[PDB]
Design an enzyme around this catalytic site. Sequence first.
Site: not given
Ligand SMILES: [Fe+2]
Length: 850
Positions: A516, A850
């Site tokens: 991320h 996500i």
């Molecule tokens: Fe993730």
Amino acid sequence: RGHKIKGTVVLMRKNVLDVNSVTSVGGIIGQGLDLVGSTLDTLTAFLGRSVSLQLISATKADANGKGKLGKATFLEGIITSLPTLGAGQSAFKINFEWDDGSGIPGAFYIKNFMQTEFFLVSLTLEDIPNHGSIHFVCNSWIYNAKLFKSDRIFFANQTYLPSETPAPLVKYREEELHNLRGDGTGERKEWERIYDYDVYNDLGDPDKGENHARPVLGGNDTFPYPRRGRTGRKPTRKDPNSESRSNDVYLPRDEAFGHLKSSDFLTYGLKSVSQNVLPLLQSAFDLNFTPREFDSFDEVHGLYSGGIKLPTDIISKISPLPVLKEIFRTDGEQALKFPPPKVIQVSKSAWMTDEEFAREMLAGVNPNLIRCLKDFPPRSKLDSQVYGDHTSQITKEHLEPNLEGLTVDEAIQNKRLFLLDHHDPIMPYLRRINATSTKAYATRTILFLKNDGTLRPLAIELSLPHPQGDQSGAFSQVFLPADEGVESSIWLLAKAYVVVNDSCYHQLVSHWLNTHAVVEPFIIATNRHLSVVHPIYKLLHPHYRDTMNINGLARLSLVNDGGVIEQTFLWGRYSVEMSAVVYKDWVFTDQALPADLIKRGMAIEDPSCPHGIRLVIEDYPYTVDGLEIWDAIKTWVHEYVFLYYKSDDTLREDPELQACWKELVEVGHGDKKNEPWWPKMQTREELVEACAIIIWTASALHAAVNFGQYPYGGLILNRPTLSRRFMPEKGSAEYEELRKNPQKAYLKTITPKFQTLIDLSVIEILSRHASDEVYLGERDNPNWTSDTRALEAFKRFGNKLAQIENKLSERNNDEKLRNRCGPVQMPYTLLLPSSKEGLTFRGIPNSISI
Ligand SMILES: [Fe+2]
């Protein structure tokens, strides 16, 4: 003679894409009348002097060298049907005047003169001379024209390297890039497509009060961090070095992906768990509507079956919630059910086995950590606390029990000793951690490789910070396997204290920092310096889908003060800052799968082997499968880079690539700007190596680390997130309850029932595939490039990924590979490249969505 170039615009309405209007609920899309546009005659509203398009020539320049202009022309009629017209799309026809003098169009300007913004998807031209159809893929929101100094420009299908830019389009190309960069001032507005960097001065709220303040992650030697996308907000009043908090976190407009199904808006669903579910759940605990605690293991299991009996009141406000409808099951009134997590669908008890414990380090939610043990006792990297001068207290005598009967020296020699080391990051903060409600250990697990090829735990070392100061080392106790009596239960408690460490490192480092956080400076550098036309932009672009958007969310809601990660995981309020301290050791080139494997001693380089390396445990699923995936990416990235670049010189001449990689390095990961391991952009092999690491991280690594969260952790007994009670001591009353009722002792040690509900709600979503996901390699959207060489190359990636899928499935049909399934009988499918929507235990997306 004049001729009319025939034109086709495909856009999608905002109402078709926006959460608030798409707020009914959605359940089947790719359909409707595969939205025609046409029908529901509001398409007529695009058809006056509402939207204008203006062709730009690629072959004929004005006096100052820039492409000639076509005449601004408006949308002319509604197109009902087209062979490629997808769902929720609307089509409009428009004919442009051109000649034998306005040349070959390679671009267009567009002006929305309407109130509402719309997502222009494409433009197609059906032509004049001996030129085929030109396809333009836009995929970008067009806000009212009054908001822009220079009109919205788009380019055709053709991939051009900066040398290969058509002369009339060179200024335009560079000028877009300029418009994208900005000047690094102002507040960033919703309608803006401006890309830049800031530090994480973002997560805290010191205006609410000083205990809500968080440290600046990045820009500094104590807490180095990747940059994040710049937002423009005013400083908080209390700390001028922090940015003021908002509900509304900007990311560049086109990075936020709209959706056709309402169930697919997972970030809104995640913002809804924290802002609507949490407080309504809280209520029901705090007042007295549900028991505060779990009393038995069956009560945890009752969450998947009968569910949590909840008042009709509060059930009435968490069950018409838009996205959350797909993640909560409602029998009628008093019921909030969780899906059976895949770890219990065969055996309910099998999680407690030693085989599953050891095995999930090779193949579970965090299958990335384990080290081959090369000396003994295992040593610390820690400094002036005296145990990186000393060591682990696990001893030769602890380790000689049942299985083979060789020495520990000989066990190391033959490569059969392995290590889960969770000692060093959490020790220095442990005294602080233990003075909150958390009660935790800094742990070490030494694992043995058995004859059948499985892993077996052999010792767990539990360390507490300081009897008499940090300069005094660690106080450590050591716990051996036992399957009989109260000792068995102490042992299962000793595994809970490891898993708890692991949940935490997994979430902040293996998940948040490694995918991320770390991909973000890359997305920004690409958009600041690589044009949409640039080959490497097109390689890397699918791998960025929705990423700044989910990171914009996590900043508002996951990684913020009092957020889910803080409320849920072991490190608590120190979570994000400890993650930064670990980022001091983050090395980009060691994120390459073979490099990681070799470093952690789990692989060794052998040029007589499938991938040029050989595993020291054959059945390390994550990694035999990962290796197949890594090589597919790196083969694809190699054919693609080497298609465009004829020499290392053509690369060094590429000023877009060069400025992009410079900015990544000196700014985006600027706290690592003097690190010797960065690839120079001197060599084509270096661009292949870095392009392969970006994609590995964003696709396969993120998937291996993410989609196994609810399947393994949706059972809180298997992956607890916090320990809140130290091990029971021999004389004590806690020890008689451990004897008398160990399920109750287990539960008072792990996450409380309330935070467990939050943790399960969060990860259930985090483990779901949105329907409209674009997975690894088989996949992009339409006509991305008109370069068929690249297109052919991409097809070879898809085919090879497909071939790999059959080969992986084949392996899960293999009863010889015990570690792929476990006692829990859960085939390792987290690296299978394709998937349907939902909580599947499989499917590798292109990016961190996500
Ligand atoms: Fe993730």
